[PDB]
Amino acid sequence: MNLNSIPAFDDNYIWVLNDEAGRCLIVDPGDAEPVLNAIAANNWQPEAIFLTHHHHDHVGGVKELVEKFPQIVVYGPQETQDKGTTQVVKDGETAFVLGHEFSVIATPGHTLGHICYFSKPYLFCGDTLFSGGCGRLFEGTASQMYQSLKKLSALPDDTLVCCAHEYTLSNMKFALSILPHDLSINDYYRKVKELRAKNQITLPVILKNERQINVFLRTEDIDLINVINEETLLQQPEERFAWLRSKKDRF
Numbered sequence: 210m211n212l213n214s215i216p217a218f219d220d221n222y223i224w225v226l227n228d229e230a231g232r233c234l235i236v237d238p239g240d241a242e243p244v245l246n247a248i249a250a251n252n253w254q255p256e257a258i259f260l261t262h263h264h265h266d267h268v269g270g271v272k273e274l275v276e277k278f279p280q281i282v283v284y285g286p287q288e289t290q291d292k293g294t295t296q297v298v299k300d301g302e303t304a305f306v307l308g309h310e311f312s313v314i315a316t317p318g319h320t321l322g323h324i325c326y327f328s329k330p331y332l333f334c335g336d337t338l339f340s341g342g343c344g345r346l347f348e349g350t351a352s353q354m355y356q357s358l359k360k361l362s363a364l365p366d367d368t369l370v371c372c373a374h375e376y377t378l379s380n381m382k383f384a385l386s387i388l389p390h391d392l393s394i395n396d397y398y399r400k401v402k403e404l405r406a407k408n409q410i411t412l413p414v415i416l417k418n419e420r421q422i423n424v425f426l427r428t429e430d431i432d433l434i435n436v437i438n439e440e441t442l443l444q445q446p447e448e449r450f451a452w453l454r455s456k457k458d459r460f
């Protein structure tokens with residue numbers, strides 16, 4: 210099994226999983242052109258598309274891909290039913306692709322209907338979980354995003370976080386604005402900066418390591434609580450999470 214990234218727009222990645230026969234799965238294709246080129250260049254045979262949510266940079270390419278490859282099954286949440294989805298899926302359901310069983314996980318936050326797809330070790334989490342960060346709350350509440358990250362954090366340590374955007378460096382700069390003396394965050398920031406100085410991709414990341422350097426997965430850590438509670442006297446986890454996400458909104 211091979212995991213490939215195809216850049217699109219300014220900072221999107223279209224993930225492609227292909228098996229040993231060249232059959233492939235395409236995740237969140239917002240621009241069909243680079244995907245079509247890679248399919249041709251690599252002799253891939255597209256079998257399915259996964260959509261995580263309805264935003265344009267994630268679904269814009271479906272029509273052209275489906276016209277070129279009429280056999281493609283398009284999986285997605287109810288909120289993409291008008292975006293070319295042919296199999297609506299929801300929490301707890303499974304999509305069988307490339308001989309692998311992908312579990313569907315509802316992760317409201319970025320959008321209300323956002324879903325994630327998991328088949329060990331691959332986690333396609335769209336704009337919910339980023340390396341060092343999480344999605345901006347356009348439609349979901351902070352409580353919902355908090356609960357969605359709790360669900361993703363419970364996945365196995367060897368999970369590969371395949372998120373949709375190259376946000377890692379900015380996410381880690383924010384992390385240092387909150388915990389500037391955390392050695393793990395500093396070390397990861399410097400590694401991510403080194404990659405981005407050479408315009409290299411920072412993904413996928415291993416979930417085990419995200420637990421250490423993603424401040425949005427460290428809501429219940431005493432060191433973060435003490436920082437957050439020195440600004441606002443907040444007593445509940447979802448309130449502290451909202452504080453941190455609001456701070457990042459203006460960073």
Ligand SMILES: [Zn+2]
Pocket residue numbers: 262264319336
């Ligand atoms: Zn989005």
Ligand SMILES: [Zn+2]
Pocket residue numbers: 264266267336373374
């Ligand atoms: Zn996006």
